[PDB]
């Protein structure tokens, strides 16, 4: 579990890029600051999903 603590420490300010094929226009790739959830689905904010 110390690995989980380290993992929570590392990403605290580490943006990641989300991409949806096809990337029709440049909005198709965007940057987000992650939050860690159990499960296996990536969770988006609906507004940007539009």
Q: CB-wise, 31 or 41, nearer to another protein?
A: 41
- Confirm or reject binding of residue 13 to another protein (CB under 8 A): no
Applying CB under 8 A, does 41 fall inside the site for another protein? yes
SS3 annotation, 1-50: CHHHHHHHHHHHHCCEEEECCCCCCHHHEEEECCCCCCCCCCCCCHHHHC
Which is closer to another protein, CB of 26 or CB of 39?
39
Reading the block at residue 46, the tokens are: 């609906």
Residues engaged in binding another protein (CB under 8 A): 1, 4, 36-38, 40-41
């Amino acid at each position: 579990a110390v690995v989980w603590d380290i993992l929570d420490e590392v990403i605290r300010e580490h943006p990641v890029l989300l991409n949806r094929a096809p990337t029709l226009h440049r909005l198709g790739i965007q940057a987000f600051e992650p939050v860690l959830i159990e499960g296996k689905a990536i969770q988006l904010h609906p507004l940007v999903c539009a």
